[PDB]
Amino acid sequence: ATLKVIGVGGGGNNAVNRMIDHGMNNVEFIAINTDGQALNLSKAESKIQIGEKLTRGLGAGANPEIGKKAAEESREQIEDAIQGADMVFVTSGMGGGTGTGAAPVVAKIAKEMGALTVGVVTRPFSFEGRKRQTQAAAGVEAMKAAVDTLIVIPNDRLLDIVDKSTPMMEAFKEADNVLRQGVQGISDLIATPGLINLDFADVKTIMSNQGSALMGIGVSSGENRAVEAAKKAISSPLLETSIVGAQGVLMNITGGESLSLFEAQEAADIVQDAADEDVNMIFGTVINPELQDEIVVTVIATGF
Numbered sequence: 414a415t416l417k418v419i420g421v422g423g424g425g426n427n428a429v430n431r432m433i434d435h436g437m438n439n440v441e442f443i444a445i446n447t448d449g450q451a452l453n454l455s456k457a458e459s460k461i462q463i464g465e466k467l468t469r470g471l472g473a474g475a476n477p478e479i480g481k482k483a484a485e486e487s488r489e490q491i492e493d494a495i496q497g498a499d500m501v502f503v504t505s506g507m508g509g510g511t512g513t514g515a516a517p518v519v520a521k522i523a524k525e526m527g528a529l530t531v532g533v534v535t536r537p538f539s540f541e542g543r544k545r546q547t548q549a550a551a552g553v554e555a556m557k558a559a560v561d562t563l564i565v566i567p568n569d570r571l572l573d574i575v576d577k578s579t580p581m582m583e584a585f586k587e588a589d590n591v592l593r594q595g596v597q598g599i600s601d602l603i604a605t606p607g608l609i610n611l612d613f614a615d616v617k618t619i620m621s622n623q624g625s626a627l628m629g630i631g632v633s634s635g636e637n638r639a640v641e642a643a644k645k646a647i648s649s650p651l652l653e654t655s656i657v658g659a660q661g662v663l664m665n666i667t668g669g670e671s672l673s674l675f676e677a678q679e680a681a682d683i684v685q686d687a688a689d690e691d692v693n694m695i696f697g698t699v700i701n702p703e704l705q706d707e708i709v710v711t712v713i714a715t716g717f
C-alpha cells in the first residue's frame with residue numbers, strides 16, 4: 414500500500430519538513446502552498462504551488478476563502494500528485510488562510526480518488542484571539558466533512574507539556590510525534606506479517622467514514638510493560654479526542670518471544686475499560702524476536 418503525507422499551507426509544510434529531517438521510510442511527502450518562499454525551502458520531493466495568480470506567490474493573508482479557491486483552481490495538479498495513493502495524511506494549521514481553506518479541498522480530492530483520507534490539523538493558541546479561533550473552527554468542520562478520520566491537536570495543549578524554558582521548537586517536535594508515529598505505526602503493520610495479522614484492509618475498516626479519531630503508540634519494558642505501554646498508547650495530553658467513548662479500535666501488540674498471552678489480555682482489557690464502552694476491536698500481535706523486554710502497543714480508535 415502507498416502512503417502519502419501532504420502538508421498544506423505554512424504550518425503543515427513545516428511539520429512535513431520536520432518529519433523529513435527526523436527520517437521516515439516508505440512514505441511519500443507532498444508539500445502544497447500558495448507561499449513561493451516556503452515551497453522553495455520545502456524538503457518534499459513533490460511540491461505544488463497553488464493560487465499563483467491569486468496571491469502572487471505570497472500566503473493568503475489569513476483569508477480562508479483564498480485558500481479554498483487556490484486549491485479548487487489547481488485541483489488537477491493536486492489529483493496528479495495524489496494518484497496511486499492508498500492512504501493520504503493531510504496536515505495543516507487551522508486559523509490562517511491557506512491551510513484553513515485549502516486543506517479540506519485537498520482532502521476531498523484525495524478521498525474521491527479512492528484513498529483512505531486522514532486529517533491531522535491544529536487549532537490556534539487562545540492568545541491569537543476569538544476571530545482566529547472561529548475561522549479555525551469552520552476549518553475543522555470543513556475538514557471533518559471531507560476526510561475519513563480527523564485528528565485535532567489544539568495548540569493550547571502544547572502549554573501543558575512545557576516548562577517556562579522549553580524552546581518553542583521543542584514543543585512543536587512533540588506535537589509532530591502524533592502524526593509521525595501514527596504514520597509509522599500503520600506503515601509497520603502493512604509491511605509486517607503477524608502471528609495474528611493486521612493489514613491495510615483492517616486499517617480501512619476501522620478508519621473509513623468515522624469522524625473523530627485517536628492514534629497512539631506506547632513503548633515499555635520490565636515489570637508491568639503490557640499495561641504501561643497500553644496506557645501510554647491511549648494517553649491524550651495533546652489530543653482533542655480522548656479514548657473515552659470509542660466504539661471501534663485497532664490494536665496491535667508487538668513483543669519478543671517472551672510475549673505472554675496473559676500480557677496481551679491485560680493490555681487489551683486496559684483499552685476496553687478506558688473506553689468505558691463496549692469496544693469493537695480488531696486485534697493483532699507481532700512477535701519480533703529481535704526485541705528483548707520491550708513491548709510496543711499500537712492503538713487506533715474511532716467511532717465516537
Ligand SMILES: [Ca+2]
Pocket residue numbers: 601602603604605606607610611612
Ligand atoms: Ca501485518
